[PDB]
Design a protein around this motif. Sequence first.
Motif: not given
Length: 159
Positions: A2-4, A92, A100, A103, A107, A110
């Motif tokens: 999981v990316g921010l 994403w 954010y 999440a 994550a 980032c």
Amino acid sequence: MVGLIWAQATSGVIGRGGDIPWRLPEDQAHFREITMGHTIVMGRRTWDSLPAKVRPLPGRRNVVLSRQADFMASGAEVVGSLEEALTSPETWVIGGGQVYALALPYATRCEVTEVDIGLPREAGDALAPVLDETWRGETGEWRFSRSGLRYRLYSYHRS
Ligand SMILES: NC(=O)C1=CN([C@@H]2O[C@H](COP(=O)(O)OP(=O)(O)OC[C@H]3O[C@@H](n4cnc5c(N)ncnc54)[C@H](OP(=O)(O)O)[C@@H]3O)[C@@H](O)[C@H]2O)C=CC1
Ligand SMILES: COc1cc(NCc2ccc3[nH+]c(N)nc(N)c3c2C)cc(OC)c1OC
């Protein structure tokens, strides 16, 4: 994974008045480059903040968090919680100060664009999350937008 990903003023401000307080096309390009072909998760307010002609975000599986049960986001999946929204192997999170922060604990990457504009944090501002000491950062060099906005890129990752 999981990316921010977000773009912030140096101060941490990412949004104000339901919009972003700058225009940095180089950042749009970067955002598009990174998220293209992936699942994106965004807050209902981000969704609403999207100019009509780029919603849903083309080429990405759009997921929108809302608590509102009648809420429809044409061409996106509306969900009532992060955990339903984080179903894809590589998601994403693109999508709002509030989101954010939800999440964050999930994550492992980032992507931040820092925009060199002096903008004090204000009550109501959508703000970038703080990355604690669990994170490792790589800081890119300052550049000048074609528009004279200075900006730089950071990439963050953690176990
Ligand atoms: N510079 C950039 O990188 C960023 C710029 N921005 C800016 O950020 C601002 C939007 O961010 P923000 O104001 O924080 O709003 P968000 O995008 O974080 O979304 C807020 C909405 O998300 C939903 N949501 C909040 N958490 C939950 C939860 N735990 N369970 C179910 N639904 C939830 C709610 O939807 P609901 O009210 O329908 O129930 C809430 O109203 C805008 O100004 C936008 O322009 C937007 C993204 C990127
Ligand atoms: C007001 O005009 C526009 C506004 C927006 N807002 C959403 C938006 C904008 C820049 C962003 N930049 C980064 N680094 N990460 C994001 N998550 C991000 C998001 C989520 C997006 C647009 O296109 C993508 C656009 O016009 C092109």
